[PDB]
Write an enzyme that holds these catalytic residues in place. Structure first.
Site, PDB file in Angstrom:
ATOM      1  N   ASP A  15       0.822  -1.016   0.140  1.00  0.00           N
ATOM      2  CA  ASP A  15      -0.055   0.039   0.023  1.00  0.00           C
ATOM      3  C   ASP A  15       0.889   1.110  -0.011  1.00  0.00           C
ATOM      4  O   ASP A  15       1.396   1.654   1.086  1.00  0.00           O
ATOM      5  CB  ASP A  15      -0.818   0.065   1.260  1.00  0.00           C
ATOM      6  CG  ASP A  15      -1.843   1.393   1.387  1.00  0.00           C
ATOM      7  OD1 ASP A  15      -2.059   2.001   0.354  1.00  0.00           O
ATOM      8  OD2 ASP A  15      -2.286   1.372   2.467  1.00  0.00           O
ATOM      9  N   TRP A  51       4.971  -4.026   8.109  1.00  0.00           N
ATOM     10  CA  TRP A  51       4.260  -4.969   7.853  1.00  0.00           C
ATOM     11  C   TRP A  51       4.789  -5.956   7.070  1.00  0.00           C
ATOM     12  O   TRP A  51       6.087  -5.749   6.639  1.00  0.00           O
ATOM     13  CB  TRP A  51       2.804  -4.433   7.360  1.00  0.00           C
ATOM     14  CG  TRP A  51       2.744  -3.847   5.826  1.00  0.00           C
ATOM     15  CD1 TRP A  51       2.612  -4.420   4.564  1.00  0.00           C
ATOM     16  CD2 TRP A  51       2.775  -2.262   5.693  1.00  0.00           C
ATOM     17  NE1 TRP A  51       2.503  -3.454   3.784  1.00  0.00           N
ATOM     18  CE2 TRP A  51       2.750  -2.296   4.328  1.00  0.00           C
ATOM     19  CE3 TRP A  51       2.820  -1.266   6.431  1.00  0.00           C
ATOM     20  CZ2 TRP A  51       2.754  -1.020   3.310  1.00  0.00           C
ATOM     21  CZ3 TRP A  51       2.819  -0.108   5.651  1.00  0.00           C
ATOM     22  CH2 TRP A  51       2.931   0.103   4.391  1.00  0.00           C
ATOM     23  N   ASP A  57       9.345   0.665   4.629  1.00  0.00           N
ATOM     24  CA  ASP A  57       9.092   2.034   4.134  1.00  0.00           C
ATOM     25  C   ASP A  57      10.644   2.668   4.030  1.00  0.00           C
ATOM     26  O   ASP A  57      11.420   2.333   4.665  1.00  0.00           O
ATOM     27  CB  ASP A  57       7.991   2.659   4.790  1.00  0.00           C
ATOM     28  CG  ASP A  57       6.816   2.290   4.678  1.00  0.00           C
ATOM     29  OD1 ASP A  57       6.549   1.551   3.753  1.00  0.00           O
ATOM     30  OD2 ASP A  57       5.917   2.996   5.420  1.00  0.00           O
ATOM     31  N   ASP A  70      -2.710  -0.625   6.260  1.00  0.00           N
ATOM     32  CA  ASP A  70      -3.726   0.730   6.071  1.00  0.00           C
ATOM     33  C   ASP A  70      -2.860   1.824   7.309  1.00  0.00           C
ATOM     34  O   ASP A  70      -3.541   2.762   7.620  1.00  0.00           O
ATOM     35  CB  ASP A  70      -4.808   0.669   6.363  1.00  0.00           C
ATOM     36  CG  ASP A  70      -5.534  -0.325   5.356  1.00  0.00           C
ATOM     37  OD1 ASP A  70      -4.863  -0.155   4.114  1.00  0.00           O
ATOM     38  OD2 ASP A  70      -6.635  -0.725   5.521  1.00  0.00           O
TER      39      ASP A  70
HETATM   40  C1  HY1 Z   1       2.726   2.661   4.003  1.00  0.00           C
HETATM   41  O1  HY1 Z   1       3.379   2.828   5.056  1.00  0.00           O
HETATM   42  C2  HY1 Z   1       1.919   3.807   3.351  1.00  0.00           C
HETATM   43  C3  HY1 Z   1       1.115   4.295   4.137  1.00  0.00           C
HETATM   44  C4  HY1 Z   1       1.345   5.697   4.753  1.00  0.00           C
HETATM   45  C5  HY1 Z   1       0.232   6.318   5.299  1.00  0.00           C
HETATM   46  C6  HY1 Z   1      -0.941   5.815   5.597  1.00  0.00           C
HETATM   47  C7  HY1 Z   1      -1.140   4.771   5.130  1.00  0.00           C
HETATM   48  C8  HY1 Z   1      -0.224   3.693   4.372  1.00  0.00           C
END
Ligand code: HY1
Ligand code: HY1
Lengths: 360, 122, 124, 360
Positions: free
Chosen positions: B26, B51, B70, B99
């Site tokens: 995501d 995650w 990330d 999320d």
């Molecule tokens: C994954 O870390 C990306 C993200 C950022 C902010 C809110 C939801 C998902």
């Protein structure tokens, strides 16, 4: 002519809706867009910095936001806050300091809630260890950190009690927290297991009645938590699906994907065919209308690729939201009637909310 | 196997949300953001937490553990946005959940891009 | 009269970049942002300073001085973006120039939207 | 595998360009996008908060940005700054505090420049009173306002002198400022009137040579300022237009709308037909290539709706930019040759710049 400021929102509170625009492509400039659902008019906005969350006070007088700042945005000291804004002037009034662990994530309703009586804001933390934070609105202070909620997620207020809420835990049960008048935990309880985390995970979004909440699962089952007593009683599953539905692999999908019309017991759920692992956030092919008393579907309508919804009880309305556009439905009868679509209400929203009219 | 080494693959294949290892992503793929699958774009910082999950590799028929770290501390990359959800679960199974901002514990939590780090066989 | 009073006029007309008094707007029309042509959206603050344009009124055939005050202190409205440049000049004629943020001297300089305030007939 | 940081930009400096994305729709999250012009690859980015401006140090080692922060973005104390970033690591190194009046506006080159010797950053202030700000890069200090530039606008460095620059003033002449080694004004001079502000306003963007600058006007005239000698000698107009051109009302339009190829004396200008009051920022129908010695047009090619350009003297290239897409041209011959288009380089950019190569 002379340009003036200081003006209030031009439409009555009862017309207003709040589209939380994450602006994920530029997530440091998230904002709330305020619209008139009766005519689609843009009424104003509240800036919410990085990944803001929003709710309106239960008495309708204030807008609460939750956000994160840094001294230099991408560097410097972090400040997580709740802000109190006037609902009619859309002006900042007060900042409430939070510990630097407020949840950063997509805009599920249950990450930023309040007690029924409106006196306490109840928010989700993740550091990534989870806990629930309590903010005393009158004092403008963070007053409690519910570590009992570690390993749980999201806040479901109990509308039949002044300062009680539930959270979904890693055991598949619910933890209920009852706050005292000081916002500290006054008591707590833990339900029996409601659902199997591994075999039939539920969506966190409740279909919330006055004294019970329903939850739908990844596989189209329904679970309930009845909180008419101090001890929550859990049940389920019953299936949303009949045999024809099963043959086409219909399952739920979305984010804030369910709603309950309390007067009728109708539950609204976003559904799509060809369900399989990985489709739980797919846009709605249909909205199904379920009679929660008979545990049977009564209607189905096109979903307009919606992902999130919300219900207004007293005007019998449902809003749906596909990320950018808001659909307004009359749900006074079992088949929803589409009244209008507000195009371009957001760039990247997964949450819309009505201004409260029910009071406290 | 070549399917395990994205730096040796065609960039168009790796930068696609249907690349096999990006099965619960995501966010913006870091390999489209001036980084690679396993290196943050210049001036963005890896997340120490993420995650996780498994993805099936259809090229060798095996299943692999993936860590979706990330890169953080720069504003949104904006490129190659994915929202894949295989085996993703809600926040009550927190480390399977995508999320939330997995930059949340970084010195600067601004989300830049996400990626899919191969840990090993599932 | 009606040509000089946008609050009575059609909103679709006033919310258009071709509306006669918007002839040097570079920014979002405040009337599309929860404000009107002469009132800031709630919670945004007027700029005390502005660029000025002279715009031709298609009804009475007269030219009018328009003061393009901004509303400030909220992030970009994003609606009804215009970039009209009638009689606009570069920064060496600074008060005729619209490629600068006329919120620059506000307590908070974040640009929200631009208004089109009718001052009066061009001076003669 | 392990995710690591600390990496440098993957392509060498000579491949790099900088697209300044204002992100006007979300202007608080402006940024610089770094691209490889040889293949269109995105290389990285530098965040620049509200309405950032950017330049690369003349020595190619650092990226300089200019921006505005506030403690709470839309409220709280303002901090205007220059930031020094490492060019290869795209990391923040140093903040230099400015007085809270740095120019907020669209990204004309001349609002944020540097002396030829690279020792001073020279920037435009507006409070709205105008002055030029001088930053000592070595010291990390703001020197003081060049108050002599009140009523003037933009910075045109003199490439034949180490710490001299000019600005365009409201009288239609140029003010030249010569800095001392401390960044304070050592001397100044004012040219005679070059152009009529009322009757033939010029675009501020220079077509800059080593010892002279040319400017185009709203009506397609050309003016020049020659700074080869002790004081600036001004001249013009000559027309860009032949009879045929005039009959179709061709005029210049754009933002950073001109360029000079110094070795050939070719001037590049964005042009469009049916010119009239209000069309001076129209996208290019064509790019015209003028020989500044002969005062004749030598080529005309499709404009690709471009608004801004930049020229590289070391590789004989021109980039053009339509707001979102960057076109790469070989200008080693009178007729430019289009090499490629980089699509989606920005959402809202009016400025692109090469990473400097050589240039001593
Ligand atoms: C994954 O870390 C990306 C993200 C950022 C902010 C809110 C939801 C998902
Ligand atoms: C007018 O003030 C809108 C604007 C804001 C910022 C830069 C340029 C123009």
């Amino acid at each position: 002519e002379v340009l003036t400021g200081g003006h209030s929102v031009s439409a009555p509170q009862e017309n207003r809706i709040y589209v939380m625009d994450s602006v994920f492509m530029h997530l440091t400039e998230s904002r709330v867009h305020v619209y008139d659902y009766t005519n689609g008019k843009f009424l104003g906005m509240v800036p919410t910095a990085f990944n803001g969350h929003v709710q309106v006070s239960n008495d309708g007088k204030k807008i609460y936001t939750m956000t994160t700042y840094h001294e230099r945005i991408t560097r410097g000291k972090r400040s997580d806050v709740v802000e109190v804004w006037d609902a009619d002037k859309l002006t900042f009034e007060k900042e409430i300091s939070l510990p630097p662990k407020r949840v950063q994530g997509l805009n599920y309703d249950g990450l930023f809630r309040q007690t029924t009586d409106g006196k306490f804001i109840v928010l989700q933390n993740a550091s990534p260890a989870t806990s629930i934070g309590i903010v005393d609105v009158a004092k403008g202070d963070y007053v409690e950190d519910v570590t009992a909620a570690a390993g749980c997620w999201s806040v479901i207020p109990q509308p039949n009690r002044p300062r009680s809420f539930m959270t979904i835990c890693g055991d598949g049960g619910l933890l209920t927290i009852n706050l005292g008048e000081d916002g500290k935990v006054a008591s707590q309880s833990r339900s029996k297991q409601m659902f199997s985390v591994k075999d039939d995970p539920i969506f966190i979004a409740p279909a919330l009645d006055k004294d019970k909440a329903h939850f739908v699962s990844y596989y189209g089952n329904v679970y309930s938590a009845d909180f008419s007593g101090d001890e929550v009683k859990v049940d389920g599953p019953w299936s949303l699906l009949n045999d024809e539905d099963k043959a086409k692999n219909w399952v739920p999908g979305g984010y804030n994907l369910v709603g309950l019309h309390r007067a009728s017991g109708r539950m609204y759920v976003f559904m799509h065919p060809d369900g399989k692992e990985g489709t739980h956030k797919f846009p709605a092919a249909e909205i199904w209308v379920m009679d929660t008393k008979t545990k049977q579907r009564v209607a189905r309508i096109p979903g307009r690729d919606a992902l999130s919804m919300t219900i207004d009880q007293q005007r019998n309305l449902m809003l749906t939201l596909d990320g950018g556009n808001v659909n307004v439905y009359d749900i006074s009868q079992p088949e929803p009637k589409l009244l209008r679509t507000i195009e371009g209400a957001a760039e990247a929203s997964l949450q819309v909310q009505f201004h409260p009219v029910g009071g406290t | 196997h070549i399917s395990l080494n994205p730096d040796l693959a065609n960039e168009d294949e790796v930068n696609s949300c249907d690349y096999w290892r990006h099965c619960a992503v995501d966010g913006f793929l870091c390999s489209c953001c001036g980084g690679t699958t396993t290196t943050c774009p210049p001036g963005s910082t890896p997340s120490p937490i993420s995650w996780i999950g498994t993805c099936h590799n259809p090229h060798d028929g095996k299943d692999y553990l993936i860590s979706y770290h990330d890169c953080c501390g720069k504003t949104a990359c904006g490129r190659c946005q994915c929202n894949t959800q295989t085996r993703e679960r809600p926040g009550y199974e927190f480390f399977l959940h995508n999320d939330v901002n997995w930059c949340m514990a970084n010195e600067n939590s601004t989300f830049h891009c996400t990626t899919s780090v191969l840990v090993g066989l599932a």
